[model samples]
Target: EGVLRVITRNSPATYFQDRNGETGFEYELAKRFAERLGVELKIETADNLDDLYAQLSREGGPALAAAGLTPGREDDASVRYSHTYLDVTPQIIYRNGQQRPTRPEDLVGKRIMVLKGSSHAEQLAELKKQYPELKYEESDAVEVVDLLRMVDVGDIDLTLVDSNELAMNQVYFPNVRVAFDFGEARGLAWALPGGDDDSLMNEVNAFLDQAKKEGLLQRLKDRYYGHVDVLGYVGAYTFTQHLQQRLPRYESHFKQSGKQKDTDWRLLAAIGYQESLWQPGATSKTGVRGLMMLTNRTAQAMGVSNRLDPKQSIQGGSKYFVQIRSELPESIKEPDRSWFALAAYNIGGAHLEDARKMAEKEGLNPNKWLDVKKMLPRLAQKQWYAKTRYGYARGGETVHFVQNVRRYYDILTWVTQP
Candidate 1:
């Protein structure tokens, strides 16, 4: 295989760009599959499932379609699917404060919409047979996020989406709540055209099986989905509002300070917002104060003239985060590196290392943040603490602190981004 060409829909869950470079579950999976075949991986995005299948139908088109597709009996005539990489079930969602539709019968006559040519629509067509009154409006040139955004604002009563897609978007569009499942489970796999390409398809299956056995698939899943799914709607809503109303004033200072430390400004701002909701005068019961909630000892150590001043607090926090983050082992690459640093920032480095040691003791890879985060919370229990050099920390709070910043940082990165 000289090259592996894959067509997928562009979305946060499927494919997207970030500072670390191109990422997303589908991209990572396909990239590895290509590497397995010793081929250069090339990716293309389709407008929708219609366009994806159309491209796959071409004589010299993509070798496979990795567009979060649900392989159905209907597609058997036109395409062959590889071993499923992800399991998904279509969802019916509505605004949180609105009427909830818990079943197919409840959805009847509801003003529902599905993306044009999405699996949600494909599944809904089959759903219409038993429930003839099941009607919905479908449109093109939009995304599931857009549909869910509408649901958040009550522009539509309900929408059909899949679990993976909803889980990714609900981090940002918090008010859109899942009402119920569409039906039973569905499998998402790479689609290959119907032919005797057994060689390639078999290789694809082998690669998937290997990836699963080696835990690459689980790690990829954890990278994107682990900390994001459980965010509260009202908290997300409030964060967005504050980003609009309060952030503009301190935004420039954050950017300036981030430059000094080579940190992304939006992320720094996200930390500040999460800590003090961008308030300069904010203080904690424990004597932590200001935008970054700097303790008096930390403020003095950072040489801050006044922790009460927004710019100094933000600048100090930015430099302070950089200081802690740079001390972690250089080999641990980013997002995880950043996450571990954030964890260290909250719980102190000794406690963080204790968690890593605990992670290794439990036969987990201490280097991976996924396992380390799981291990960190164990520090609070006497069962775990009596074993550590730095013991009895509110280590669970460190976990929550890291996750909360990730959620907030994620939203701000998009909001402040082009």
Candidate 2:
């Protein structure tokens, strides 16, 4: 009679909204768990860690909280922890061009801030016992990404962040860099109601255990995090520069294609950037040329006689992209559907089809980009590709290829938003 009401925080590593509606690693896990219980999932988002912990175990509270909660010493008596689903190292973050801290002693006189109720505070406390002079302020005012922004803007000299969170977000705040890895990796788990009722706890634990056994956890991790680490600080900074310098010149071309194909102009621009860094004259000796980097065959097929013409390249690329997307199974939804088309554009449709078949053979969902991406790498292996019709292909590159496009697309969306 009731839905599985869950509380989480808004973060890249947790529950957050994007162009493709509500999605986050935690949200996916919670949704699957809810499905297992035959219940609808209701998500309540809290602004900060302190509010999240307080709201979880209160009367009429959620069944559980899955906002990447880490088990800490100051846990409430009414709250219990689920099995650890992920481990993340705590890191000291500092802005680029600053002297990075090498160890705890280096942090002795720096201005360090962290979320008030986070496990980061406990780690700092433990370090204080040894350094005796290390100092930090705990605030409920800022979330983890906010602290990263503060560091990026020089509002704070340093802050602590989870390693995975940093990886996912560093592209957006290229000025902030990890000073050093702090303490050992901490386990992230869900906080459940602790008082005698173990029913929900048992169910969550059982569900998570089964999920782990079935490699679902790894699949989700691969989906969200596997591509995040591809871009480094220099690469991100370069892309940011191009966003300002090169994007304006061809923005109209992409927008025109957007109108023609009914697709996001920023997405088209992202593809242009990935293909040729928005350089119309960009060419490969192999003859894939221009903003879209289309081959002679693809360019002709898309009615682009001159691949070097910026407008023609963009329009041709957009059409080809939409054409590939349309050929995909209707059951594949947006974001994933878009991702699958991107991979196809990278490795060719035949190779992508072979990878999907491999995914299905392995009991994975061929329609899910998350699941299919895991199988894509197999197309390069002799044992796996020997069985496929498409034979050996650089499937690994296609994974990175699609990932880079998505990252660029995200950046374009953010920078171009009014």
Candidate 3:
């Protein structure tokens, strides 16, 4: 099968590498499009427009286009492109205590920083033509977040950046403000290799349109931008409460177990709670037993004399999970792969591989937990599983198990983080 390689810089508007994983409106949307087309999605990171254009021009390679590329590049004609998904509007971001500029002329004498080769730089150049006295420093390697930091730390008086990026990063720099909006907006789109791939482009557009109509796009927006400070604020309160009430009971155990294995034993405790409400005597009909729910083989592998030992079981379970995580392919990036690792832990890895193969065959994104999840339940059917190396497993249960664990992990992280 063919693959689509999408390239973009690490930015809040286009892409963000967070603790949860690689994410952003554009990355997810592109992944979804690749799944719809039954193609493998490869994402390449580039630092600036020069490298981006150079990569796009590489012969017989994936297209150079991205969600944030400016449209007027000369190389654009060589690539077939899709309609713009994001609108890029430059804005003046200033320190919170700084006085707001009422006009372009007001920006004079301010040490403004602009990202090199950006539409912001272009706009500033044009502004200079009109005002003549407008002075700003052009940063060669400055990224959006760097500019935000520059303003936040008072290193620069002001900087210009995309509004969406400003919204996403504003919480980190609560002292920064959007002083003004530039008059023009640039359309951002994906560029594909020039060919008769119009059908695929149309399909992507249709999916995007439906995504917009079904509120998927809006939900994504809200997920990333909504209640930016609520997590931090509520988290602080929860930590205070936990420190007073919950910490006394579990602190010694967490500390000892965490120190032994170099892990946050709170996480292991959370997993145990998710599995069996932290019941040390817990048992299942499948013969799984103890706080960590160790099977006979797992217990034996961990050299357990007794599966019911809470500390030993917790350590064993943590080690087992780490092993599973380590065994995953390097190509599978985080969060999605973490979910997949959990799924594999529930079912065997071979069965999960079968499900991934089935997903690939059925035009779903095996790398995306969201897309692969839909195909997991199909593994129960003989018509589907018969073709796989590992036949007929209750894949739906594994999918649900992974989802529940992810939700539990999120809640635990929210409740426990300092």
Candidate 4:
């Protein structure tokens, strides 16, 4: 009957439902903490700061909050904070092609909205004494992305945000740009209810300390934040434009194929889009063919006699992916397993494995994507690949292929979500 419940909000950085199920920075750490305690993890959802704080007020609602939070004096008086884990800088965001504000004084009369109950709000509150005429809005009513959307579309003049949120959202809403950062970075930690609970808190602290030394924390950070720049602003914009203009025509095929293979349709569509930009007739100089770019042998092996048929191509490609993915060690998790499979889909699985071995030979972690992808480029070089059985390939292109699919999958997940 061991159970550890915590409060979290639905956001890209904190907690959110994905194709693979619940995952985020907080989810990962909190899950680890629960495992250390030998308990099942139960998460209480927070709609906004008001709902978040309210949940933390109850006797058993949540033991702590892990929604990328920063505690202020008001919070400190009512709750205790865990060891600070993430550093976040408050940023003032505005649309591109507009005036950029360099300092706090420049914020006078600017229409700005900050997340309600945010450290960003605390920063704005302190600045009010000097910038008396400066008035900005605050809301626990909306997520940071909502404010960013408003700023993007000119519904608001400016919005204060944290650097992490800004980085991820800038991919989805390319127009919102950072004007300037605030004074100093703020600390993000889990907040426990007020009064004594030293036993639980200390346990959490010990877990954090060990996590830091083990490099698990760093790897997790890279897993999420590292891929933020995979797609640039212009690339993202073009993809989104094509998503609307092109995706609907082929959406049903991807969704249908994805369902058959127990995969997320958005992911299938992303891979299809990456391979041929959704064009059924797409072909390569080497004769790779169709929407999912299956080689003729692969198409035939997957029961696809017609490579040019969109249905046949998507179905065959997705089935082939799941099959190859199963061949990977079960220890490798979902997204990583899927990523490794995509690399194999580009180059053959043997070459990808050889690349992993080469990476291990160089003292890098072969199981980690961030490290293995570096070794992929080496397959194109004599000094690197000469020792391997698969002597040469355009393995760098495979890296680009996986990166592109990942970016497209992220964009599709957000845009296509109801």
Instruction: Report lDDT per candidate.
Output: 0.77, 0.80, 0.68, 0.78
Off by over 4 Å in 1: 226-418
Comparing candidate 3 with candidate 4, which one achieves the higher TM-score? Answer: 4
Q: Is candidate 1 or candidate 2 better by lDDT?
A: 2
TM-scores, all candidates, are 0.58, 0.58, 0.57, 0.59
Q: Best TM-score goes to which candidate? A: 4
Clash totals, every prediction:
0, 0, 0, 0
Of 1 and 4, which scores higher on TM-score? 4
Candidate 2 lands at a TM-score of: 0.58
Question: Candidate 2 local accuracy as lDDT?
Answer: 0.80
Instruction: For each candidate in turn, give its C-alpha RMSD to the true structure in angstroms.
Output: 18.0, 16.6, 15.4, 18.1
In the range 129-206, model 1's lDDT, one tens digit per residue, is 889998888876556766776788788899888898887667656588888877678778888888765888888889
- What is candidate 4's lDDT per residue for 67-176, written digit by digit as tens? 88876664556787788787778888899877999888898877988877777787888899777888989876567766876798798898888787776567657688
| Among all candidates shown, the one with the greatest lDDT | 2
If both were scored by lDDT, which would come out higher, candidate 2 or candidate 4? Answer: 2
Model 4 residue 264 lDDT score: 88
- Which TM-score value belongs to model 4? 0.59
> With candidate 4 superimposed using the best TM-score fit, by how many Å does residue 282's alpha carbon deviate from the native?
18
Q: Ten residues in a row with the worst lDDT in model 2?
A: 225-234
In angstroms, how far off is 340's CA in candidate 2?
Answer: 26
